[PDB]
Structure formats: C-alpha cells, structure tokens
C-alpha cells in the first residue's frame, strides 16, 4: 500500500493498524523514512505557515458570521440588555418548537448566542458597524492567502531556508522581541490612540479620516517637545458613556488605575499607555543579542560563563546552548510551558481585571472564557512535560551534557521524584482528611466542630495590595506607608476604589472554603507534576527497564516478564497525567464557577458555608445548578437550553465510552474479532464482499489513546454544557 | 438569488456531499497499491 508514504513498516501492514498508525504518526516527521534535518525544519516552517493561515481563516469566519447573521449594530446601542448572537442556525432536524425557542437576540431566525466575548472585544477595539467587521474578515482572508503563499514559496528549491538560518538564535530573538512583540505592541498602542479612544468618545476614525483627525489637540508637539504629561491631562470623566462624547476627555495616555465606572473595565488610555510602554521595553530588549554588527551578546558565551564558583551546580550551563539549539523537543517544551503559564495568567487576570466594556456583566461569557483558557493552559502544560520527556528519550546527549544542570537533574531524579511523591501524599492526606472531618461533623449536626482555617496569608497579600476588608494595615491598606505615599498621586486612588468595592471580581474576599479548595488545587498541581516529572526522568531508563531509550517514547510494554510491565513508558506517564490534569482543572473551574455564581446572585454566604464539606459542593453547586440544564427539554416542552442538555448527556455518553477502552484490554477483543471474521467468511451472500485490510483489534497504545480521547471529550463537553447552561438559566 | 438561500444551499453540501466525497476519495487512496 502507499498510505503511510512516510513509513514502509506501516505501508506493508496487512491490517487496519496501518490506517490507524498512519493517521496517528502523520506529524512525527523525525520518525519518517529518510528524514533529513533540513527537510524536517523546512517542513515545520511550511506547516507553521499553514497553521497561521488556519488561525486567520478561523478569526475571519467569526467576524464574517457576526457581520452577516449577527446583531452587532443593535448590540452596540444597548450592550447590557441585548444578547450577542454568534451565528444563525440552519438544521433540517429542528421542529417548529425548536426554531421558535432558538429565535432570540432580536433577530427573526434561530440563532446561537455567542459566549466568546468577541462582541465586547470588538466594541472596545472600535468596531461599530457590520461593515467594519466585514472589512476585518476580508483582510484576514487576504492575510491567510498571503501566509499560505509564503508557506508554499518557502518550500521551493531557491527559497527553502538553510539550517544555518534555522539555528540562528540571536537574530530570531532580536526580531521577535523587538518587532513581533515590541513594535507590535507599539502598533497596538497607535491603534488604541487613533481609533479605539476616539471611537469610544463618539468620533469615528477610519482610513478615510485618520490622516486628517488628530488623536490629540496638541498633535505630536507634546511628544517632540518633551512635555509628555500633556497627553494625560483631561482624562475621561466618571460620567462618560462609552461610545459617546458625553463625559469624554482629551487624554490619550494615562495611569488612572482601576476601572471605568460605566463600562466597569480598564481605562482605554491606561491600556494604550501600557502597550506603548511594553513596546519600547521590548524594543530595547530586542537589541541585546549579537547580529551582523559587533554590539550585543552571544547566548553560548552567557550560558558557558554562568557557573557558580561554589560548584553546587557542577558545570553550570555548559552545553545547554547546543542541546537546546539541536533539540526541537527542548524548545517545544519550553515554549509550551511558557505559553501554558501565560494562558493561565490570561485567565486569572482577565476575570479580576476585565479589559473589555461590559464584559464583566456577561456572566456566561466570563465563565466560558475562564474555563476555556484554564483547560487550554492545562493541555499546554501536559504537552510541555510530554515533549521534555521526548527530548530526554531522543535528543539528550550525556557526553555533551557532562555534569551540567540537566545531567544533575537526571542524577538526583530519585530525590526529586521521592520528595514530589511525599508532598503529594502530604497534601492529599491532609486536605482530604479535613474535608472528611467537616463532612462527618456537619452530618452529625455539629458544624461548629469543623476545622476552618482562615487563608490569612492570601488575605495579607490582599491587604498589602490595598484591601481594607481584613484589618491588617500593611502597605496600601496603611495610609501612612511609604508604598502608599509613593503612588498616592499616580494610580492608588483609582486602584483602591476598584479593590475596595464589592462590585468587581478584583481580589474577591476569601475564607476557609477558599483555603481548602486552594490546597486541593495544590495537591492536583503537585500530583500532575509528579506523574509528568517521573515520566520525563525515567523515560531513558528505570531499574525495571534500564534500556527504555532503546525502545523509545511510546512502546506498549515490556511483557509480563519482571512481574509485569504495563504502562512502563513516558507516553503512559503522559496518559495518566492527562487524567490528573483533567481532575485539577475541573477542581479549579468548579471553584471559580461556584464562587462567582454565588457572588452574582448575592448569596456569597452559601459558598462561604457549604464549600467546607464535599456534600456542599455536591448539593449546592452541582445538584442545585443542574436544574435549568436538565430541564432544557422535558415532557412538557423545551427551550433554547435543550441543546446544552443534549450536549450534557453527550459528554456523559462519550466519557463512559472511554471507560470501555481504558478498562477492557486487547486480547478479549482480538479473540472476539477472530470469531467475527470467521462468521463473515462463512456467511453466504456476505462472503461475496471481502475486507482488503485484515480486521484486527486496536493496539494497546492505540486503545489507551482512544479511551483517553473519549474521556477528555466527555469531560470537556459535559462541563461546557453545565457551565454555559447553568449560567444562562440562572442569569 | 439572495444570501438568505446560502445556508440551505450549502449546509447539505458541506454536511453530506463534502464528507461523502472526502470519505470515498480517502478510502480509494488508503486502499490502493
């Protein structure tokens, strides 16, 4: 066959395993037949171009559908009352009741109500008409075409880059820090000053107007005279109606701090100043590394030079330059870990400090965004650790990393893993024990016997940031502190107004329930890290299989020889860490959603009192809030939440189906499929038809992967349905 | 011929014709010597 053109070992397989493995190994270029390093890098480059084109097309489709089937123009008028519609529904299976139930948003045809917040985002950017969205979609289609053409072009013989170019670290770092990050944020500041702020103040600025419309009455004279403070005078009044000129100011750059009163989001002038400042900072950072001129550093020199003279790190960072530059998996792991941390930060900061107008009052949108980004963060962290393990298996060179930090990590992997296991057991034992203690005492009717620990440390941090709810009087809660006196006339007034009002999610009040769930989150993070770190460090070998690197990253097992070797691979460590990562993110999003739901309905006491025992979570969060969702459709009718109820049950179904693959293993199914093949061959009128690929049972690793995928899809879809439907049915 | 007809014209295509043709062509490709 020539299906897996990249593997004759698969092309010559006479079973369906060929098709399955050709699917699952299509993007492992390193393992493909006759793969050279140059071809590997050039294919990755072209694939990146295609991926960027896909992203541009996806955003273009969002914009186009919101422009065509959306209600953006009538949403920009009363954004707090109009529901934003994502796209129209055309399903030939809907009944008239379903069409009527889904006809909402002020439109006259069934629609989906967006939970992505793109409406608020674009409104804040400066989009007001559907023509603006359509023009944006056109531009993104053009950009997708440009990037597809670039990907095709850079695969041509005279345009294919070389490896001396792919491994040029200094120039890439300089350009990414200065232009991709720095100048890009500077351009975003330029946009926010030329379009977003005038649009927020009711003055339309576009391509036909921006070359004649001054962003500031003084023009650029304050900039070119050094009187930069003139750009902060006359900010927007507290009675500014976003999108109109009533209450507007003339400032373009400020540091008011806090939130705009009406929109309840960060000041657009503050955002513009933020982006300008980080832009110049990044432009400066991008001039650090040496390029075709004499100035700059060399990363190899810095790494080799950095070795503490005490010798507690050995050779320090010698050889890491070559290791990282020659290992794409090391780079992939670093990038994935950093992006995962940044997306968690995006989630954590975007709910505490909303940046888009009126987004804070779109409760379902906020919960959906937070859950989305936390799940993405967990996926990225699991991927970072998996690719670290793959690097250890494939790209690690001990002789090169003779007694540097990496070799030392491998040296005391036993200590690392044992201490990680100890801290995991510590956290688990005691967190679960406190939860069970509270459960039992409350069950016996003695809630006063609960062990409720005040998160005094987090409360102290809040008070330091300026929260007066708790009496600590530390740094910014203290009016006579140096910290207060330093920023009293820049941002502290607004920041204190924001922090000390209970209208926002900025530094929500915390209690013993928060303490307990936080230590549950700590347990989850530590156990996921335990599994992933153990997989990465034992990937090359263990006492059971001291030659694992020979077998690779994702082999099934080593047989029942030494007492059993099931799940003895780093891939299997990843497979288990994915259950644990799904468990931890579930805990995190449960905590977030319940706290915010209780605050939104104003009964924060319900969380404060029921979060201390697991029956409280099971009853007052899941059981209590599942009512509208499970009533989406019922014997007496249906509403728009019927789709979410259906997806809820869909997630349950696929989750339980994944249980099949995870519990039942191959031999049973292989002996069953044998009988099935016998039956087909000896059935008249059906033996006229014959399989071209011998029907076989799924492989061990394949079954693990399929069960994991089913489990993950059930997890994600069930919680998406629950969160969105419950939020939409309660508010 | 307005844009309102495009959903009814396309959804059956994208949901039954494109998948059917893709599946048939992919089948022919994967089972081919």
């Amino acid at each position: 066959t020539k299906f897996p053109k990249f593997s004759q070992a698969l092309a010559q397989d006479p079973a369906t395993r060929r098709i399955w493995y050709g699917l699952a190994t299509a993007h492992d270029f390193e393992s493909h037949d006759g793969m050279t390093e140059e071809n590997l890098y050039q294919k990755i480059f072209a694939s990146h171009f295609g991926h960027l084109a896909i992203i541009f097309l996806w955003t273009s489709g969002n914009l186009f559908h919101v422009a065509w089937q959306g209600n953006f123009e009538q949403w920009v008028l009363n954004p707090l009352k109009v529901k934003p519609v994502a796209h129209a529904i055309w399903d030939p299976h809907f009944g008239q009741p379903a069409v009527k139930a889904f006809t909402k948003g002020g439109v006259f045809y069934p629609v989906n109500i967006a939970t992505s917040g793109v409406y608020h985002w674009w409104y804040t950017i400066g989009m007001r008409t559907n023509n603006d969205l359509y023009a944006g979609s056109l531009f993104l289609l053009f950009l997708s075409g440009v990037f597809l053409f670039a990907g095709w072009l850079h695969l041509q013989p005279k345009f294919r880059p070389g490896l001396s170019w792919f491994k040029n670290n200094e120039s890439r770092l300089n350009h990414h820090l200065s232009g991709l990050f720095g100048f890009s944020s500077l351009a975003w500041a330029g946009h926010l000053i030329h379009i977003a702020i005038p649009e927020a103040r009711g003055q339309h600025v576009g391509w036909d107007n921006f070359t004649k419309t001054l962003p500031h009455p003084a023009g650029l004279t304050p900039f070119f005279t050094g009187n930069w403070s003139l750009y902060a005078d006359n900010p927007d009044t507290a009675n500014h109606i976003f999108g109109t000129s009533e209450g507007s100011g003339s400032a373009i750059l400020t540091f008011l701090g806090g939130f705009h009163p009406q929109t309840q989001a960060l000041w657009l002038t503050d955002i513009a100043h933020h982006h300008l400042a980080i832009g110049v900072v990044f432009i400066f950072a991008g001039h650090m590394y040496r390029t075709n001129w004499g100035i700059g550093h060399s990363l190899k020199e810095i790494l080799d030079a950095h070795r503490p003279p005490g010798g507690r790190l050995g050779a320090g960072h010698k050889g890491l330059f070559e290791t990282i530059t020659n290992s794409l998996h090391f780079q992939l792991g670093l990038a994935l870990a950093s992006i995962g941390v940044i997306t968690s930060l995006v989630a954590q900061h975007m709910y505490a400090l909303p940046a888009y107008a009126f987004i804070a009052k779109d409760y379902t949108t906020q919960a959906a965004l937070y859950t989305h980004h936390q799940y993405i963060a967990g996926f990225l962290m699991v991927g970072a650790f998996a690719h670290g393990a793959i690097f250890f298996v494939r790209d690690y060179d001990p002789e090169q990393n003779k007694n540097n930090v990496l070799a030392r990590m491998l040296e005391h992997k036993e200590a690392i893993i044992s201490h990680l296991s100890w801290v995991s057991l510590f956290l688990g034992f005691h967190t679960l024990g406190l939860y069970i203690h509270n459960d039992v005492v409350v069950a016996f009717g003695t809630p006063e016997k609960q062990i409720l620990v005040e998160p005094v440390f987090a409360q102290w941090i809040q008070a330091s940031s300026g929260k007066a709810l708790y009496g600590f009087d530390v740094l910014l809660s203290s009016s006579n502190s140096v910290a207060t006196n330093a920023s009293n006339n820049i941002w502290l007034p607004g920041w204190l107004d924001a922090i000390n009002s209970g209208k926002n999610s900025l530094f929500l009040p915390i209690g013993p329930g928060d303490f307990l769930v936080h230590h549950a989150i700590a347990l989850g993070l530590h156990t996921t890290a335990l599994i992933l770190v153990k997989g990465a460090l034992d990937a090359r070998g263990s006492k059971l299989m001291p030659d694992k690197k020979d077998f690779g990253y994702s082999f099934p097992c080593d047989g029942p020889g030494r007492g059993g070797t099931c799940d003895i691979s780093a891939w299997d460590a990843f497979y288990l860490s994915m259950f644990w990562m799904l468990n931890t993110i579930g805990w995190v999003t449960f905590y977030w959603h319940w706290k915010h739901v209780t605050i939104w309905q104003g009964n924060a006491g319900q969380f404060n009192e029921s979060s201390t025992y697991i029956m409280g979570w099971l009853r007052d969060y899941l059981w209590l809030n599942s009512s509208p969702l499970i009533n989406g459709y019922n014997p007496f009718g249906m509403n728009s939440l019927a789709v979410w109820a259906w997806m809820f049950l869909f997630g349950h179904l696929i989750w339980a189906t994944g249980f099949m693959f995870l519990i039942s293993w191959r031999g049973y199914w292989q002996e069953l499929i044998e009988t099935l093949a016998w039956a087909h061959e000896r059935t008249p009128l059906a033996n006229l038809v014959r399989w071209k690929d011998k029907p076989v049972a799924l492989s061990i690793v394949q079954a693990r992967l399929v069960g994991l995928i089913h489990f993950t899809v059930g997890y994600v879809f069930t919680y998406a349905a629950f969160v969105i439907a419950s939020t939409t049915g309660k508010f | 011929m307005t844009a309102a007809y495009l959903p009814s014209i396309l959804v059956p295509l994208i949901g039954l014709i494109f998948p059917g043709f893709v599946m048939g062509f992919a089948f022919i490709y994967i089972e081919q010597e």
């Binding site: 072209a46 295609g50 097309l57 186009f64 023509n131 289609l141 597809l148 053409f149 095709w152 | -």
Partner: peptide, 30 residues
Amino acid sequence: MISDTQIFVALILALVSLVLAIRLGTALYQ
C-alpha cells in the same frame, strides 16, 4: 446590511485561499 456583492467578494477571497491551501498541501506532501 451585508450585501450579496460583499458576500460574493468574501467567497472569491475564500476560493483564492483554498487554491493556495491546496498548493501548500501538495508542496508539504512531497
């Protein structure tokens, strides 16, 4: 508010992008 001519221009750009995507897919498959 979005006219059929606008939708047709969008469709033409989408078709151009599809042609370029097929070209890139071929080049990558090689």
